Amino acid sequence: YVAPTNAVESKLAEIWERVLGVSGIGILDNFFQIGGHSLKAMAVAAQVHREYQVELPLKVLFAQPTIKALAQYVAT
């Protein structure tokens, strides 16, 4: 992961490492690649709700639980 593909993933990238407690993370990763519970990725979806007023529910975080799929759920 030397860079995201859109600032949408740029934000979900920061949130991802913060709420998930990681440092870097890739793009189409998997919120359950090495964490615990789902309250974390959800926190990320909340990062999408504050950063944007986009509808990103938990079921959407489950249908597309990653940075590219999330930033894409928002970014597009």
From Swiss-Prot:
Please indicate which superkingdom the organism of origin belongs to: Bacteria
Q: What does the comment on domains in this protein's record state?
A: Consists of six modules, and harbors a putative thioesterase domain at its C-terminal end. Each module incorporates one amino acid into the peptide product and can be further subdivided into domains responsible for substrate adenylation, thiolation, condensation (not for the initiation module), and epimerization (optional), and N methylation (optional).
Q: What does this protein do?
A: Incorporates six amino acids (for tyrocidine A, Asn, Gln, Tyr, Val, Orn, and Leu) in their L-configuration into the peptide product.
* Annotated source species: Brevibacillus parabrevis
Assembly and partners? Large multienzyme complex of TycA, TycB and TycC.
Q: What else is known?
A: Tyrocidine is a mixture of four cyclic decapeptides, tyrocidine A (D-Phe-Pro-Phe-D-Phe-Asn-Gln-Tyr-Val-Orn-Leu), B, C, and D, in which Phe, at positions 3, 4, and Tyr residues are gradually replaced by Trp, depending on the relative concentrations of these amino acids in the growth medium.
Q: Which residues carry this modification: O-(pantetheine 4'-phosphoryl)serine?
A: S38
Protein name stated in the entry? Tyrocidine synthase 3
Residue ranges of domain Carrier in the record: 3-76
Q: What is this protein's gene name?
A: tycC
Q: Which family does it belong to?
A: Belongs to the ATP-dependent AMP-binding enzyme family.
